[PDB]
């Protein structure tokens, strides 16, 4: 084990040896955006792919061409912290080397006149942070991976529903990656049809006639030729015997002496095989069998040229007599059948109006741009630019792969555009599907589902920007001069940056990161959405997309999706799943040999899964890999079945690969119904980070991967000895072997203190390591929010009793003792960001002065001389944070108010209090104040004070950086000089300047001294120049909105504890609202005297089938029983041998497990800190579907002194007498969800009103109003209540006179309404009246 692994080692049940550990949980984001921005030397996906695809730009045949060289991204102007403070994109510039050439006269291959090659700026693109997060406009945003249909060819059925005939249709479809679609479909009467879009149904064969095909070779490609020879007489028929399968003949077919086929008899295949053995090629038929055949090609007379019969014509006896007199004895007919070879193309030709190529192109050009007359060359360029142009039509490598795969081709690469063989082969495959062979596909199948990611979508929007600019470059180079410009005047960087900033700033796939939990970050980055551009919508789709297909196994989690409007469209990516090279999903399996399961693993995609048969994770095997049975449960093709011992191909990797990271942290998930497990994993995101972090006693072992591999905690990159621990920073001295030769130094980790998360919670980092401690590489140093010792602590573990306690837990309610709220163990910390803008009106500018009209001095004592509140003054609702007054004039005073002014002489002031105030009903502390000011405006006193504060903070911090870094460097220098020429007591007297220039032997040691000297001097000069750069970044002005003088932002830190009305939840989906917060005196207590902290309700457990909360409760009681026994053995000062014995027995404990332990730990120093970390309770890991059963819980309870049944007798806190039927108490890990009540509660007496309709506008904290909607009006109609409704929708809401009349009548204490007419009905009259429709009101 490593160093924090032996700090508090978690007991682990489970019986499957894990052979592939949990991968880097954010690999989708980072690997995608590594594919995006990287210098790829080839046509690999990236920016290089987009540039090499859309370039070279050439002129309108004016022999002036712009081509490409390379690109580069500059470093950002602003680091991420200053970028979140200021509000810009965290972006990087995009320098591109472009090369312009111009050709000469009558030399297309000849030498150019000049080349012009320079760099050019084209927009900023945002960079991903180290965690998968972008920053666009001050906030921290995540782009969710998209799921959609793979580009390729899909053969769908769409059974039954057309015209209720019972017939199935078939439609083929070519879906490109960029371009127009293609459809082929049948009709209820066996006619094929093409669609270039979802446009009108066109006959099919015209697209064949759009590809320069006559009727001859169309019927040649889609049919086989039956040859009628007239061997001297009687019009015989050439025979292949396989052609007669399943058929019935109208006469006797005789071959070589014997009549084999009888008249009116169906032909058995015995006849066919006898005809094969009898060497039968050509047989004799009457003239009547050709009455149903159809001629293949054109038959004419030779000399005269007159038409005997054109192609695709049925043959009557008249046409036979015509072809007998011309002399032709060769007849070519089309082989038909009702089952094998359907004559669909012949029927489609008989439907089709056109004949030749030109009328086909005219028909398409008339049927795509209707209403205008056609033109030949425009139609030719159109059909060029539909499917065969490199510009407006493109299948990617993935498109060509699926297009070859579903047609059973050989090569998996090819051109992006189509070809004649492609469309003809798709039509052949569709006719083959209609003829009964082959199968249709289904769109839910994850082999036909591509997962997009951030790099691909950013690349495609970048290509949109490049074509939008290449239109302008073609416009400019067509008018291009010879030498007046370097080649940057042609290109505008407004559309490129506009497109990429429009995508990252506004899309359904790019949204605010849910950042209130490390789990919530790490599962919002791992999200597979099906919405957005290029995907289905909630209104249109659909049920099969919502449903779970059997190929989601191990690729997409089935038990995590947001229950609500979009169920299943917002899927989550499974734990072990990766993304294939071609973008599809693929999951790990273990390769199985003859009988031995080899530890090598193969990632398999979905369409490669169905061929093999895959074993079960929950299987049993010896050390030689042999399965313990001779038959094992497996799945072959979406079907669970029991197969043989050595027929298996692959084993599942682990027990956890079917779920997500959100669902796998629910212990005992195999004991819950999938409904409540869906709700539990859906709400495990929403835990607020509590003030402490408190180690889930019932964990699943997936907690450390989510803790480390998210971005909240600080993972050590190079291990060593911890030199310095502060709340601000952690300073690590790197070991000698892990240290680079050049740039020696030591590591420093600047922790992020109390700061604002996007969901107003407080993301914070706290050190968990002490001074002088050995650390491993990749070991946690600073716990983030909701993390303890590098675990994931979403909430806290509390003593729970399941009993109905005086009805306070009635429906689902939770009831909490005061022992929780006295301990502040649910008291959370929120940070709000109030803002005060100060603009420039056309009546005058606003001021941030402290002098405010008509307020008290006691209201202003919490302000300074500058008018902006001090740091650290506890304010309540209504206090003034930023004193801001706006100039006004033209008071328009009334009568007797003007009389009063005259009497008392008080000037109505020229200004108005519009100060920033605290919202109604919060509290807390002002912790951070910022003043953004437009350059060219006088900075007031507190702005310069904040600037001097930040300047001293930055200079002190960079001086501490340089000082402790060179302290490590001089401590390396001393280690250098001792080897080879030691000055033991002489060195530390002579100064640090004369260490770099002391002499020593010419070896690697003198070269080492030269390296350390130049690194010292380089860090000095780098310190100086970056200090000047930091000062010029701080002191300069700030960009603002057009026409705003200055913005004062004030960060409140509210400390909200708990109260009845909050929501709490275990990890099993047992929601509840805290109802009464009892004192400790009233809680049920057992015979030892420990009061239970939360009394749940048992009635939810049989109804909602989540029985696993009971098992988690029992095992929590077991964990805290071991913790109490360890606490007793530590309080009695037992020697370390007794603790070693008891912890040894606690960690052995059960069946065959995966948890070998001490004695290998140290004698005292590791064991005693482990017992100090176990006195609050020994944790238990339960790997999800494989972990702890009941009997192991019973055997662990027998280690404690607890009863085996897990139910203690309890004594009521009030009557003091025993409850009959002893009750279940235990330790459940429960979470405080962020639906806190004080964010939800408001009320309105009378506030603002909406402008266009005089109604109170709804919202918060806009004072809202509970919308008394249509169903509630029906409810009051359903009673006899009529005065209630009359005031409910006239006087309280709408009437502009009536509400003020009501307010006067109420403050006079006279309850009475003067109803009048609603205002919005008057608006309705003006809206209908502002049509051509007269509507009036009538006489009396």
């Amino acid at each position: 084990y490593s160093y924090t692994e032996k700090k508090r080692i978690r007991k682990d049940f489970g019986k499957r040896p894990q052979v592939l550990d949990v991968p880097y949980l954010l690999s989708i984001q980072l690997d995608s955006f590594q594919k995006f921005i990287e210098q790829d030397p080839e046509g690999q996906y990236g920016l290089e792919a987009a540039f090499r695809s859309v370039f070279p730009i050439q002129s309108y045949s004016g022999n002036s061409e712009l081509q490409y060289v390379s690109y580069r991204l500059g470093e950002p102007v602003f680091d991420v912290q200053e970028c979140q403070i200021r509000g810009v994109t965290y972006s990087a510039p995009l320098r591109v080397k472009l090369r312009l050439v111009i050709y000469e006269r009558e030399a297309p291959e000849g030498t150019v006149k000049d080349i012009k090659e320079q760099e050019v700026y084209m927009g900023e693109i945002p960079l991903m942070t180290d965690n998968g997060t972008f920053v666009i406009n001050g906030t921290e945003r995540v782009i969710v991976s998209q799921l959609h249909r793979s580009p390729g060819v899909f053969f769908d059925s769409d059974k039954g529903k057309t015209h209720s005939s019972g017939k199935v249709l078939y439609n083929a479809r070519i879906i490109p990656y960029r371009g127009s679609w293609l459809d082929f479909e049948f009709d209820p009467k066996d006619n094929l049809f093409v669609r270039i879009d979802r446009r009108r149904k066109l006959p099919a064969t015209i697209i064949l006639r759009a590809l320069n095909y006559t009727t001859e070779q169309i019927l040649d490609l889609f049919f086989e030729k039956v040859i009628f020879e007239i061997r001297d007489n009687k019009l015989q028929m050439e025979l292949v015997p396989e052609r007669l399968r399943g058929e019935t003949a109208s006469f006797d077919i005789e071959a070589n002496g014997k009549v084999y086929v009888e008249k009116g008899r169906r032909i058995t295949a015995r006849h066919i095989r006898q005809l094969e053995k009898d060497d039968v090629k050509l047989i004799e038929v009457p003239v009547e069998y050709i009455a149903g055949k159809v001629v293949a090609k054109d038959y004419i007379d030779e000399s005269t040229g007159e038409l005997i019969c054109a192609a695709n014509m049925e043959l009557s006896l008249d046409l036979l007599a015509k072809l007998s007199q011309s002399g032709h004895k060769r007849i070519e007919t089309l082989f038909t059948n009702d089952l094998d070879h359907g004559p669909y193309i012949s029927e489609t030709l008989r439907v089709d109006p056109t004949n030749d190529r030109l009328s086909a192109l005219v028909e398409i050009y008339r049927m795509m741009r209707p209403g205008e007359p056609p033109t030949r060359e425009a139609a030719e360029s159109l059909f060029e630019n539909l499917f065969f142009s490199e510009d407006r039509y493109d299948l990617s490598a993935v498109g060509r792969m699926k297009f070859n795969r579903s047609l059973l081709r050989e090569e998996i690469e090819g051109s992006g555009i189509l070809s004649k063989d492609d469309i003809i082969d798709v039509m052949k495959k569709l006719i083959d599907i209609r003829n009964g062979k082959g199968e249709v596909d289904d769109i839910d199948h994850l082999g036909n589902r591509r997962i997009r990611s951030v790099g691909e979508m950013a690349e495609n929007q970048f290509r949109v920007g490049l074509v939008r600019v290449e239109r302008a470059v073609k416009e400019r180079l067509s008018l291009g001069d010879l030498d007046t410009l370097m080649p940057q005047d042609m290109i505008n960087a407004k559309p490129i940056s506009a497109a990429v900033k429009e995508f990252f700033g506004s899309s359904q796939l790019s949204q605010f990161m849910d950042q209130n939990n490390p789990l919530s970050e790490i599962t919002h980055k791992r999200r597979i959405s099906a919405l957005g551009p290029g995907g289905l919508t909630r209104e249109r789709a659909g049920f099969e997309v919502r449903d779970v297909h059997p190929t989601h196994y191990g690729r997409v989690c089935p038990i995590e999706t947001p229950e609500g409007p979009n169920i299943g469209l917002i899927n989550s990516l499974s734990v072990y799943a990766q993304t294939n090279e071609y973008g599809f999903l693929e999951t790990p399996y273990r390769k199985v040999t003859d009988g031995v399961v080899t530890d090598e693993i193969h990632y398999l995609s979905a369409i490669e899964e169905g061929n093999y048969v895959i074993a079960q994770a929950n299987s049993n095997l010896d050390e030689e890999g042999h399965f313990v049975e001779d038959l094992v449960t497996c799945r072959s093709k979406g079907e669970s079945s029991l197969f043989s011992r050595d027929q298996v191909d692959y084993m599942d990797v682990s027990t956890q690969q079917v779920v997500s990271v959100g669902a796998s942290l629910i212990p005992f998930l195999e004991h819950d119904d999938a409904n409540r497990a869906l709700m539990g994993a859906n709400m495990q995101r929403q835990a607020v980070p509590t003030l402490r972090a408190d180690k889930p006693l019932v964990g699943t072992g997936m907690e450390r991967a989510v803790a480390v591999d998210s971005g909240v905690t600080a993972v050590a990159k190079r291990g060593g000895v911890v030199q310095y621990v502060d709340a601000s920073r952690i300073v690590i001295k790197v070991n000698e072997d892990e240290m680079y030769p050049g740039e020696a130094g030591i590591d420093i980790y600047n922790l992020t203190k109390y700061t604002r998360s996007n969901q107003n919670t407080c993301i914070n980092q706290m050190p968990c390591v002490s001074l002088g401690e050995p650390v491993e590489r990749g070991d946690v140093l600073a716990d983030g929010p909701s993390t303890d010792l590098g675990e994931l602590a979403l909430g806290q573990n509390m003593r729970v009793a399941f009993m109905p306690w005086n009805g306070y837990n009635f429906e689902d309610s939770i009831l909490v003792s005061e022992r929780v709220v006295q301990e502040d163990r649910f008291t959370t910390i929120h940070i709000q960001e109030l803002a005060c803008v100060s603009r420039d009106t056309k009546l005058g500018p606003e001021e941030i002065t402290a002098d405010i009209p008509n307020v008290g001095e006691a209201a202003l004592s919490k302000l300074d001389e500058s008018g902006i509140v001090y740091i650290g003054a506890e304010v309540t609702g209504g206090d003034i944070l930023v004193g801001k007054v706006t100039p006004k004039g033209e008071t328009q005073l009334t009568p007797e108010e003007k009389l009063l002014r005259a009497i008392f002489g008080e000037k109505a002031s020229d200004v108005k209090d519009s100060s920033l105030r605290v919202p109604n009903g919060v509290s807390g502390t002002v912790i951070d104040v910022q003043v953004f000011t437009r350059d060219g405006v006088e900075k007031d006193k507190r702005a310069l004070e904040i600037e001097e504060m930040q300047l001293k903070q930055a200079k002190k911090d960079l001086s501490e950086e340089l000082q402790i870094l060179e302290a490590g460097l001089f401590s390396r220098i001393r280690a250098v000089l001792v080897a080879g020429g030691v000055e033991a007591e002489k060195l530390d007297k002579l100064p640090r300047d004369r260490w770099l220039e002391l002499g020593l032997t010419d070896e690697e040691k003198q070269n080492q001294l030269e390296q350390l000297a130049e690194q010292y001097d380089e860090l000095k000069h780098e310190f100086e120049k970056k200090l000047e750069a930091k000062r010029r970044k701080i002191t300069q002005g700030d960009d603002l909105a057009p026409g705003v003088l200055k913005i004062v932002k004030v960060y409140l830190a509210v400390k909200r504890r708990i109260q009845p009305g909050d929501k709490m939840a275990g990890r099993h989906g047992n929601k509840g609202v805290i109802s009464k917060i009892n004192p400790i005196e009233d809680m049920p207590y057992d015979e030892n005297g420990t009061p239970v902290d939360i009394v749940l309700n048992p009635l939810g457990v049989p109804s909602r089938m989540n029985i696993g909360q009971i098992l988690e409760t029992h095992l929590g009681m077991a964990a805290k029983g071991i913790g109490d026994k360890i606490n007793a053995m530590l309080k009695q000062q037992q020697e370390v041998a007794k603790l070693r014995e008891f912890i040894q027995r606690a960690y052995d404990l059960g069946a065959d497990v995966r948890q070998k332990v001490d004695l290998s730990t140290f004698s005292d120093e590791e064991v005693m800190r482990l017992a100090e970390n176990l006195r609050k309770g020994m944790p238990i890991a339960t790997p999800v579907f494989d972990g702890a059963k009941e009997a192991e819980i019973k055997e662990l309870l027998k280690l404690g002194d607890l009863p085996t049944s897990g139910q203690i007798r309890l004594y009521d806190g009030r009557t003091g007498e025993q409850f009959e039927r002893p009750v279940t108490v235990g330790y459940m890990y429960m979470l405080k969800l962020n639906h806190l009540v004080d964010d939800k509660m408001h009320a309105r007496s009378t506030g603002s009103y909406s402008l266009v309709t005089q109604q109170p506008l709804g919202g918060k904290a806009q004072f809202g109003g509970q919308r008394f909607g249509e169903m509630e009006v029906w409810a009051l109609e359903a009673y006899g209540a009529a005065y209630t409704l009359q005031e409910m929708l006239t006087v309280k809401s709408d009437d502009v006179n009536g509400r003020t009349k009501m307010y006067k009548n109420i403050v006079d204490g006279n309850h009475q309404m003067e109803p009048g007419m609603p205002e919005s009905f008057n608006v309705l009259l003006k809206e209908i009246r502002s049509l051509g429709i007269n509507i009036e009101l009538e006489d009396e």
Binding site: Y121, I491, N492, A493, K494, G936, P1042
Partner: protein, 52 residues
Amino acid sequence: ETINKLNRISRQMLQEMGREPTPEELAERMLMPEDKIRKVLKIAKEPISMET
């Protein structure tokens, strides 16, 4: 005409400097006293649709 001059010059300078031009650069770039350029930049904004 003044608004189109501002968009043209801020199109030219954006590929010269690289970040975007501040109006302090438009003071010496053009002939206007840079306090009028703020109000010309303010006037040129199309109003939002009230059903946006």
